[PDB]
Amino acid sequence: SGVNNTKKWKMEFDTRERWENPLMGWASTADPLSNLVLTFSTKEDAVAFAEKNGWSYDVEERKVPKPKSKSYGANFSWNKRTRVSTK
């Protein structure tokens, strides 16, 4: 339920092939940018960094939890369906 890993923007790259090493079955790759993850404070900063480095990018907007109405009293409503049958 923590939200501290949702405070900063990231940049990642497309996933590419990983294959089994014939000897030991490990996961082998030829993608040098496989584990490259960059951190940014803002979308504008990230887009600028990608543009100057000549990478094509897709931006996905932040999904923020919507504010909600929370009432402990509603659990004991007289005429509503919010009445809980168990605590």
Partner 1 sequence: EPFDNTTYKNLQHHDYSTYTFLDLNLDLSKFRMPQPSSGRESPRH
List of residues contacting partner 1 (CB under 8 A):
77-81, 83, 85
Burial of 50 (0-12, 13-18, 19+ CB in 10 A): middle
Minimum CB distance to partner 1, residue 34 (Å): 53
Cα 4 from Cα 58, distance rounded (Å)? 24
Q: What is the dihedral of CA 10, 40, 67, 58, to 10 degrees?
A: -50
Nearer to partner 1, 62 or 81 (CB): 81
Shortest Å, Cβ 79 to partner 1: 4
Least distance to partner 1, CB of residue 77, Å: 8
CB closer to partner 1, 66 vs 80: 80
